[PDB]
PDB file of C-alpha atoms in Angstrom:
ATOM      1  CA  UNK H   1      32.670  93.503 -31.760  1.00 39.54           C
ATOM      2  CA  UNK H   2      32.358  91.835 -28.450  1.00 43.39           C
ATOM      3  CA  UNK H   3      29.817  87.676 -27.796  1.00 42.70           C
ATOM      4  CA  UNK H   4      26.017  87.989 -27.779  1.00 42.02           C
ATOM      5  CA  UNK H   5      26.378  87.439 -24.052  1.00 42.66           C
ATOM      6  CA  UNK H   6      28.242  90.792 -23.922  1.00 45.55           C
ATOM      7  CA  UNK H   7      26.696  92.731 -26.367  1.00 46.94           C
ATOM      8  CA  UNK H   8      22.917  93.008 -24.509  1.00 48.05           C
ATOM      9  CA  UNK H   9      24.805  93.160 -21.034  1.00 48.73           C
ATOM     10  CA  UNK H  10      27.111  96.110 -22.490  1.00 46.76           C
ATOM     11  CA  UNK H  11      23.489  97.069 -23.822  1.00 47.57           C
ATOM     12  CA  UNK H  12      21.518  96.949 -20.468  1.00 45.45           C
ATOM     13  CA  UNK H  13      24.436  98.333 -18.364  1.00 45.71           C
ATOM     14  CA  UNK H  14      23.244 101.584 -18.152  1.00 42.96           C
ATOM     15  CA  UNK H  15      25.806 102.105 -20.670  1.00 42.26           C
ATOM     16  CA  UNK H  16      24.042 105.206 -22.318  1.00 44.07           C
ATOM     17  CA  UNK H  17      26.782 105.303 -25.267  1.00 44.77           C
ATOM     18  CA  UNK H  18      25.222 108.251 -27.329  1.00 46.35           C
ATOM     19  CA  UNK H  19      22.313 109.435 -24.915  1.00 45.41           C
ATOM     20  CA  UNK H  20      20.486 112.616 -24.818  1.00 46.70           C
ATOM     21  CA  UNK H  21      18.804 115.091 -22.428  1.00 44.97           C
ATOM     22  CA  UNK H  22      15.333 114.920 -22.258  1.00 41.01           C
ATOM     23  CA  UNK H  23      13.530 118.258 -21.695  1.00 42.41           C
ATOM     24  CA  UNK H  24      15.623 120.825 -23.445  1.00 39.69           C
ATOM     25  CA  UNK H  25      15.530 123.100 -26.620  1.00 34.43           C
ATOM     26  CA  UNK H  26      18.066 121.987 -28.429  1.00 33.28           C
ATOM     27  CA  UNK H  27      19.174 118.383 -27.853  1.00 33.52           C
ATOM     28  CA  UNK H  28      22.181 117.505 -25.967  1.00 30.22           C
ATOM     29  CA  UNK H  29      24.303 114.793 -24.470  1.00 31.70           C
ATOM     30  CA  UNK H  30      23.982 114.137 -20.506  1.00 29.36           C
ATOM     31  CA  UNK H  31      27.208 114.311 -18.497  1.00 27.03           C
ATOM     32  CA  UNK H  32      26.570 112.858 -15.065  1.00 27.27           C
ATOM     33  CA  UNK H  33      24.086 110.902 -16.603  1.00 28.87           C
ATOM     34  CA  UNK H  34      21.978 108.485 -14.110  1.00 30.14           C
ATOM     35  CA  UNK H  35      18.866 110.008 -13.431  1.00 27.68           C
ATOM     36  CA  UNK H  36      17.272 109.723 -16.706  1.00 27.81           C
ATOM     37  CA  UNK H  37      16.135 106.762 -18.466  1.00 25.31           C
ATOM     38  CA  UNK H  38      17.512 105.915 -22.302  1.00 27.66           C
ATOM     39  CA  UNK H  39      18.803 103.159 -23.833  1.00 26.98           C
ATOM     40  CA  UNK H  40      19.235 103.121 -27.738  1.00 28.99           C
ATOM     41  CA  UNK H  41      19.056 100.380 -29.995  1.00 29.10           C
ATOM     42  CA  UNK H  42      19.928 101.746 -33.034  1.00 26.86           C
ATOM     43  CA  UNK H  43      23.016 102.711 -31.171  1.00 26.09           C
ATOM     44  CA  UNK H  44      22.628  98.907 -30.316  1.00 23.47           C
ATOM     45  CA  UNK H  45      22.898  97.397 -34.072  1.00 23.57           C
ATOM     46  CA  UNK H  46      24.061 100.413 -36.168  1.00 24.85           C
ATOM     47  CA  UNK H  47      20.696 101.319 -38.214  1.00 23.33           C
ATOM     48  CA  UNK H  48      18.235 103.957 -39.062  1.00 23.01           C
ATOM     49  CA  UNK H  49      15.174 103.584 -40.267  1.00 23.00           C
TER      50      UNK H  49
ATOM     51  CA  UNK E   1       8.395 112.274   0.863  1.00 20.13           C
ATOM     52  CA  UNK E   2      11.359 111.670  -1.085  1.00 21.75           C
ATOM     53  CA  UNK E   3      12.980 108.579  -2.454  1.00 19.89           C
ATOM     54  CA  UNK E   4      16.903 108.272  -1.435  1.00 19.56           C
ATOM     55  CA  UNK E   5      19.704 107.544  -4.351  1.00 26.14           C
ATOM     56  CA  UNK E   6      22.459 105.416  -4.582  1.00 24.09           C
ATOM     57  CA  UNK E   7      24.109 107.414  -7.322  1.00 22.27           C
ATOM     58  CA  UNK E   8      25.023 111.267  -6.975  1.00 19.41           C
ATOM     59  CA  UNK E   9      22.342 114.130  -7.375  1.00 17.43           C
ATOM     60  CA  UNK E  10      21.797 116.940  -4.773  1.00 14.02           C
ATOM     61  CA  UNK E  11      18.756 115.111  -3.195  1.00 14.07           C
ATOM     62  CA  UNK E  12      16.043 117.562  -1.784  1.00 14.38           C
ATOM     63  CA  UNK E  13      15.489 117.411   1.474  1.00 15.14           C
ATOM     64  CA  UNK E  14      11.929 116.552   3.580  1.00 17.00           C
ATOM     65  CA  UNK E  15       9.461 119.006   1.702  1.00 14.32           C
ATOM     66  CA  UNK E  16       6.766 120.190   3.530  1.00 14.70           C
ATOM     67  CA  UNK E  17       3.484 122.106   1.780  1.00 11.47           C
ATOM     68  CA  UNK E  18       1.386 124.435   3.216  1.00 10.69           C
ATOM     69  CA  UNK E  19      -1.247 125.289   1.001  1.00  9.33           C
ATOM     70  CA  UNK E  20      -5.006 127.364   2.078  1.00 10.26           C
ATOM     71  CA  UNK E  21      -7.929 127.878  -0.173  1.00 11.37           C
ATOM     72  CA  UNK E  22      -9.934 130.809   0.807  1.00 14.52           C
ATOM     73  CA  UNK E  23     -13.698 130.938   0.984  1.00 15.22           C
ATOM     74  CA  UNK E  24     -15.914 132.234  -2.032  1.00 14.80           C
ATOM     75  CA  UNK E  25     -19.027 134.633  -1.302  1.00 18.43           C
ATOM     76  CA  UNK E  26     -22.141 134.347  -3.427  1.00 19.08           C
ATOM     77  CA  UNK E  27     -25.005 137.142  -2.284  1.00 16.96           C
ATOM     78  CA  UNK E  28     -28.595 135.901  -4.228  1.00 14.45           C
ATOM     79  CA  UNK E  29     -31.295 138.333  -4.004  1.00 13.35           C
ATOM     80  CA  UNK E  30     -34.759 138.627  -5.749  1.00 11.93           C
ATOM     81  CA  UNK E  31     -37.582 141.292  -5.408  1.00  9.14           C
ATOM     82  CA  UNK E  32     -40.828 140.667  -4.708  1.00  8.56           C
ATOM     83  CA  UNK E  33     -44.190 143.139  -4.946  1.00  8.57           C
ATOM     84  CA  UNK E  34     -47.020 143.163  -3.110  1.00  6.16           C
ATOM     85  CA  UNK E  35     -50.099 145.854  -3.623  1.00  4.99           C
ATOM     86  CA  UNK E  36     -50.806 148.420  -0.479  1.00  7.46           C
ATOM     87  CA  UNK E  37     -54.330 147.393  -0.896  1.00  6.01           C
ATOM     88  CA  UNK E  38     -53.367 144.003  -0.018  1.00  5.97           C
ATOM     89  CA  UNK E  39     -51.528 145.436   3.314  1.00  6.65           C
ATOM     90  CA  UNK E  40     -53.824 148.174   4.948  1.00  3.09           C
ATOM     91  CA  UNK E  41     -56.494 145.467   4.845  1.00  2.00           C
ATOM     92  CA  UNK E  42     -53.992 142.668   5.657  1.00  2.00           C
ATOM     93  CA  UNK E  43     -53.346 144.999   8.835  1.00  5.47           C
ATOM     94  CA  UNK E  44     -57.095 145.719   9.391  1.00  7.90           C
ATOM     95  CA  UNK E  45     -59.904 143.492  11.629  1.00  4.93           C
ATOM     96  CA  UNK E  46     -63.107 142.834   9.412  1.00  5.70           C
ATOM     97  CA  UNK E  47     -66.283 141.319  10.491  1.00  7.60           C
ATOM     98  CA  UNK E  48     -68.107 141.638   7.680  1.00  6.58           C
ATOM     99  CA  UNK E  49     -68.291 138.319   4.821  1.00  7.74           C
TER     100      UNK E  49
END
């Protein structure tokens, strides 16, 4: 709900608010989470496609 | 070598390879004839045209 100067911070932050883990079977979410790379806009502004 | 982190992971240490490729052997062989009558007479003196 937060400014446009907060949302693309909160965005770039390495926030990783619904992330996943790269190379396994069945996808998960990362706990610990720093080493791999993901950000997600549709996470960003609430869409699919 | 290794990059260091800021963030946690258990970072490997200095890795070292030691890897040998062994030689190959390739053994090429023909056969060749040649006629007696072209050898007693190759291991003869003539004097005669």
């Amino acid at each position: 709900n937060r400014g446009l100067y907060n949302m693309v911070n909160e965005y770039s932050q390495r926030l990783g608010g619904h992330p996943a883990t790269s190379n396994t079977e069945v996808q998960f979410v990362v706990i610990a989470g720093t080493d791999v790379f993901l950000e997600q806009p549709c996470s960003f502004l609430q869409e699919a496609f | 070598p290794t990059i260091a982190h800021g963030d946690g992971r258990r970072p490997s240490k200095q890795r070292t390879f030691i890897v040998v490729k062994n030689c190959h052997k390739h053994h090429i062989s023909t056969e060749m004839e040649l006629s007696m009558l072209d050898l007693e007479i190759l291991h003869s003196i003539p004097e005669t045209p």
